[PDB]
Design a protein around this ligand. Structure first.
Ligand SMILES: C[C@@H](N)Cc1ccc(O)cc1
Length: 359
């Protein structure tokens, strides 16, 4: 229950290109490297010899593949992916010793989806059915896993910033963190939505209506690199970090990098998250090591958003993060692989419910 040595160090990546896990699809098993994404809900894999791909799902070679005779189209601002739906047998070699029949989108056409020079060929959407495409009737991978096996309904991520990490499927590994886990409620089961109730720069409150910290929504998303903040909050955050570190104007907007010869002028950032108890919150503290990401040239790893707050790899790399789906909560503890990053509580915060934005 608290030890999963087989699953420790099962993630790899390249800086800025996400974290991936080895998976097998079909019979006989086809090995594929798959992007771990808590911000989406489709299991989708390259199914055609796109030039950027080391390998791809060859449906014709699999005796257990079943055609669902249905297309799926996922548009982005940039480009897109498009594919054909089916089911097949799926395993995770460095995961639980089980095999499940899962939905798979065989990607037949894409634009700006596969990265030139990356070592992954698909995406594993770990979020809920509600945001699955084409609709919520397409059961996500993790739902299928839980429905078909005795694997407990939770997973955890230790993202260590080329890069490596651990995805513990069905449990928690206590050697992957120090101190205690602190839990924040999943507000709704679509994205991993949470509520930020207070933001501090260097220990100083931003003094904003907390509703705006979640304007639209706040999510935990392993497929995003940056800490993304709502426009107005980003505005205030930058203005406060700027004043704490008194650099070009375009650097703050992510329009150009800044280079130095091969930290203390930059403040710590505390996010207070809604706790499990009425009027109780806790805080996570991230270092400038987290929001200043090397590409010695660094890209300011905080950016504005029109889709709400996104707690991406920047945040997650400082912490062991538990996606406790059974109890509708997300746990945070100091990573045993990350001034140090901190998770602290309890704090008294009133009117935390008001911080959630409603349609
Ligand atoms: C992480 C996904 N939800 C979004 C995404 C997909 C492909 C890519 O190259 C970059 C980002």
């Amino acid at each position: 229950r608290g030890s999963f040595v087989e699953m420790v160090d099962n993630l790899r990546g390249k800086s800025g290109q996400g974290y991936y896990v080895e998976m097998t699809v079909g019979s006989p098993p086809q090995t594929l490297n798959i992007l771990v994404d808590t911000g989406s809900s489709n299991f989708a894999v390259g199914a055609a010899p796109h030039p950027f791909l080391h390998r791809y799902y060859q449906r014709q070679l699999s005796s257990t593949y079943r055609d669902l005779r249905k297309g799926v189209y996922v548009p982005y601002t940039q480009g897109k992916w498009e594919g054909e739906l089916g089911t097949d047998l799926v395993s995770i070699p460095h995961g639980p010793n089980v095999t499940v029949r899962a939905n798979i989108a065989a990607i037949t056409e894409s634009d700006k989806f596969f990265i030139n020079g990356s070592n992954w060929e698909g995406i594993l959407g770990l979020a809920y059915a509600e945001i699955a495409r084409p609709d919520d009737s397409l059961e996500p991978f993790f739902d299928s896993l839980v429905k078909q096996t005795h694997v407990p309904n939770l997973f955890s991520l230790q993202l260590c910033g080329s890069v490596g990490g651990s995805m513990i499927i069905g449990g928690i590994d206590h050697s992957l963190y120090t101190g205690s886990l602190w839990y924040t409620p999943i507000r709704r089961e679509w994205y991993y939505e949470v509520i930020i109730v207070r933001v501090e720069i260097n220990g100083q409150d931003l003094k904003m209506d907390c509703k705006e910290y979640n304007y639209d929504k706040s999510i935990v998303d392993s497929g995003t690199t940056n800490l993304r903040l709502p426009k107005k909050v980003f505005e205030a955050a930058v203005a406060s970090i700027k004043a704490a570190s008194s650099f070009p104007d375009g650097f703050w907007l992510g329009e150009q990098l800044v280079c130095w010869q091969a930290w203390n002028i930059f403040p710590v950032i505390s996010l207070y998250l809604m706790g499990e108890v009425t009027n109780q919150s806790f805080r996570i503290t991230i270092l400038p090591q987290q929001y200043l990401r090397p590409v010695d040239c660094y890209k300011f790893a905080i950016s504005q958003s029109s889709t709400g707050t996104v707690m991406g790899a920047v945040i997650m790399e400082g912490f062991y993060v538990v996606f406790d789906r059974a109890r509708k909560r997300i746990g945070f503890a100091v990573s045993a692989c990350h001034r140090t990053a901190a998770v602290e509580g309890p704090f008294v915060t009133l009117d935390m419910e008001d911080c959630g934005y409603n349609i």
